[PDB]
Scaffold this motif. Structure first.
Motif, PDB file in Angstrom:
ATOM      1  N   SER A 181     -59.035  -8.684 -66.792  1.00 54.49           N
ATOM      2  CA  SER A 181     -60.417  -8.859 -67.212  1.00 54.49           C
ATOM      3  C   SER A 181     -61.414  -8.455 -66.137  1.00 54.49           C
ATOM      4  O   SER A 181     -62.621  -8.471 -66.401  1.00 54.49           O
ATOM      5  CB  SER A 181     -60.662 -10.313 -67.620  1.00 54.49           C
ATOM      6  N   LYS A 222     -62.310  -9.996 -63.317  1.00 64.48           N
ATOM      7  CA  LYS A 222     -63.175 -11.106 -62.944  1.00 64.48           C
ATOM      8  C   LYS A 222     -63.706 -10.885 -61.533  1.00 64.48           C
ATOM      9  O   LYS A 222     -62.915 -10.661 -60.609  1.00 64.48           O
ATOM     10  CB  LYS A 222     -62.412 -12.425 -63.030  1.00 64.48           C
ATOM     11  N   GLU A 257     -54.724 -12.728 -63.647  1.00 63.02           N
ATOM     12  CA  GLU A 257     -55.096 -13.058 -65.016  1.00 63.02           C
ATOM     13  C   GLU A 257     -54.554 -14.422 -65.419  1.00 63.02           C
ATOM     14  O   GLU A 257     -55.242 -15.197 -66.094  1.00 63.02           O
ATOM     15  CB  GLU A 257     -54.594 -11.974 -65.970  1.00 63.02           C
ATOM     16  N   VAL A 312     -58.098 -15.960 -63.997  1.00 62.36           N
ATOM     17  CA  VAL A 312     -58.880 -15.714 -65.204  1.00 62.36           C
ATOM     18  C   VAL A 312     -58.678 -16.820 -66.232  1.00 62.36           C
ATOM     19  O   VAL A 312     -59.650 -17.372 -66.753  1.00 62.36           O
ATOM     20  CB  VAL A 312     -58.525 -14.332 -65.789  1.00 62.36           C
TER      21      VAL A 312
END
Ligand SMILES: *C/C=C(C)/C=C/C=C(C)/C=C/C1=C(C)CCCC1(C)C
Ligand SMILES: *C/C=C(C)/C=C/C=C(C)/C=C/C1=C(C)CCCC1(C)C
Ligand SMILES: *C/C=C(C)/C=C/C=C(C)/C=C/C1=C(C)CCCC1(C)C
Ligand SMILES: [K+]
Ligand SMILES: [K+]
Ligand SMILES: [K+]
Ligand SMILES: [K+]
Ligand SMILES: [K+]
Ligand SMILES: [K+]
Ligand SMILES: [K+]
Ligand SMILES: [K+]
Ligand SMILES: [K+]
Ligand SMILES: [K+]
Ligand SMILES: [K+]
Ligand SMILES: [K+]
Ligand SMILES: [K+]
Ligand SMILES: [K+]
Ligand SMILES: [K+]
Lengths: 259, 259, 259
Positions: free
Chosen positions: A53, A55, A248, A252
């Protein structure tokens, strides 16, 4: 450390240096491009953010040890650019990264095991670093020694790689159960590359021109170019993907590890 | 860095390389075995736990800097294995760790002072590391220089060891009163080894074949083998025992330091 | 790594090594004295305390990375002492720090960029360190390569310095607005020295004896002595003063940064 040079009339015919130098230079250039591009991609992906993602980092920057994989790949790519320069010049170049076997590895592989330990939080990072360092220096000594005592140096290296590989594996196993199956999928292939291709170098020594004489120096250069493409580039890509999956899972999604 | 090699008929008689090579090879093999075994013991004892009671580490692993002593001893033992290989081959071997004096020390002694600083929490660890590094490189330069300017390089080394030894001592004193008498007992012998045997190397230079000419290269090799037996192996054992006593006092028993 | 030596009759007339060696030795001795004294002053001032008020450190010792500037200056000064020893001996000395160009820099400049990153809290310290390391090794390869492929090595170095210098600058800008104007005054001159004199080395390569042939090796030695006087000594002094101003602003007065 150089004393020898290419003779003015060229390398003597039938010698270990009578090699296909344009072909090896092209192979080294291709390997340089691929590994340097892979390292650039790893550094860019690391700077993108944590996990799939992306982040953003809380400090705004990635951890310094996380950039080890890309640095190793870029250093190997530049070493292969220098190797292509040496090969395209006919070999025996004053700054030859091809002459002394495993001399270029004493910069990449200790860093490679350091990156592996940092990614997996393996214990005794300094111990593994120095074990790989000494194994590679024993290999360099065996490859520059013209007598039978090179097999002593080789044996000395085998006195360092055999415990280390037996130790790391065990430690790696202790970490393998900690990580989720999605990260375990990439860890499996990273460990496959490690425990399959790192043992290949001592085995390839036995059948090289200073062993049984079955693999020539040109074939050795090609095989080690493919090995570096696998041991550095592909292994670094797998480490980057494993780090992305781990971030992740833990950063995340906030999920904990199986420890 | 090698240019010279053993002549096909052997080393010229009466030269500094006309040495008892089987004896020096056996001495180097014995030193290799002893120092490598001592380093293995230090690492195993460190992995056993904190203090004499072997209290398990809270993180499950020893501090990384704590394994410096065993790493230095194992590195010195492998260097002495390479030295025995070089000596048993008659000397002048392409990968000779015996040719360039103090070249092998630039890897062990900066690490040794780093370990000493980390164990005693001495200030300016990087400063001490680089001071020892530069002193050893000045020694290497003095030993490879054939003119009188080697005594300049020696002097340059004496311009680094004299302040450093005068600084470290003072700093060591500031730490000596901090530790309990039981740890002070081992610290006293570690400091005795340091401040007694480290000054020996510059003194041994003066009387070597490039100095006054009283100590030959063979005798120099034997003396330095015993010195590495003392400066690396015994000093590392004393550091391990001092760390065990300190951990027993502070971690096992919870008692504070005299600071 | 040495193979060549000064001929018994001396360096051939008209060669690149037919140089004014007493003058270069005197210049190197003066540079040694100045840079070593500057490094000693930086270390002493760092040990004095934080800021201009010399506020005592809470731990009683300065941060270890803060002593990088003085260590780099002292290492460069000792390298210049060795260079003066080599030049006063006529050049071609077995331990010559003058022979292999930029070989001495691979120890100072990676440390210099590390110190710059630590002082300014620049991201990717390892990346910058390895970028400078590889640039300097490409320079060493270009200076030891006698063919046209040296311009390849040079180009490889230009493939590392151009991004790094373009990256660091941007990152430096992100830090430049953070610091107060008083610290910005010293940061401006540090950045002037960096971005003005670091690009000078590749430009000086083009006009050297292996480039266009306008600058001889003696003039190259003098120019690089002045550059090390600026790039190491003056830059380290500016780093020390910037650190003093930053500590006075943040630690002595307790004022926050403009972040
Ligand atoms: C990218 C390069 C890599 C991963 C190189 C790895 C090197 C080794 C595993 C070294 C192996 C050797 C020993 C086991 C001892 C004998 C000599 C060597 C160098 C073949
Ligand atoms: C195990 C090896 C050890 C502890 C080596 C220590 C080396 C020194 C204290 C070096 C000493 C030298 C200087 C003081 C300058 C002159 C040259 C040397 C190398 C003899
Ligand atoms: C005190 C010494 C310093 C700051 C040296 C800095 C060196 C460089 C900026 C290196 C430059 C080079 C490259 C850009 C590639 C071509 C070869 C060099 C070594 C001239
Ligand atoms: K990592
Ligand atoms: K990376
Ligand atoms: K090489
Ligand atoms: K090679
Ligand atoms: K070769
Ligand atoms: K320790
Ligand atoms: K230890
Ligand atoms: K040696
Ligand atoms: K030696
Ligand atoms: K010798
Ligand atoms: K700093
Ligand atoms: K400083
Ligand atoms: K040099
Ligand atoms: K030079
Ligand atoms: K030169």
């Amino acid at each position: 450390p150089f004393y020898d040079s290419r003779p003015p009339e060229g390398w003597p015919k039938g010698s270990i240096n009578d090699m296909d130098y344009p072909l090896l230079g092209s192979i080294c250039a291709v390997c340089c491009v691929f590994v340097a591009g892979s390292g650039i991609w790893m550094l860019y992906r690391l700077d993108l953010g944590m996990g799939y993602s992306c982040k953003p980092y809380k400090s705004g920057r990635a951890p310094e040890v996380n950039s080890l994989s890309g640095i190793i790949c870029l250093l190997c790519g530049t070493m292969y650019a220098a190797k292509s320069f040496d090969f395209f010049d006919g070999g025996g170049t004053p700054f030859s990264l091809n002459w002394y076997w495993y001399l270029d590895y004493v910069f990449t592989c200790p860093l490679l095991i350091l990156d592996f330990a940092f990614t997996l939080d393996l214990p005794h990072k300094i111990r593994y670093f120095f074990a790989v360092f000494l194994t590679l220096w024993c290999g360099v000594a065996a490859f520059v020694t013209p007598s039978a005592y090179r097999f002593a140096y080789y044996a000395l290296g085998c006195c360092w790689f055999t415990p280390f590989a037996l130790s790391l594996m065990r430690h790696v196993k202790e970490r393998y159960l900690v990580y989720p199956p999605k990260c375990q999928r990439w860890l499996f292939w990273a460990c496959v590359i490690f425990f399959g291709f790192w043992p290949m170098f001592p085995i390839l020594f036995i059948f090289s021109w200073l062993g049984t004489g079955h693999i020539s120096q040109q074939a050795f250069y090609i095989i080690h170019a493919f090995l570096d493409l696998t041991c550095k580039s592909i292994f670094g890509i797998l480490m980057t993907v494993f780090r992305l999956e781990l971030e992740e899972h833990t950063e995340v999604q906030g999920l904990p590890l199986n420890e």
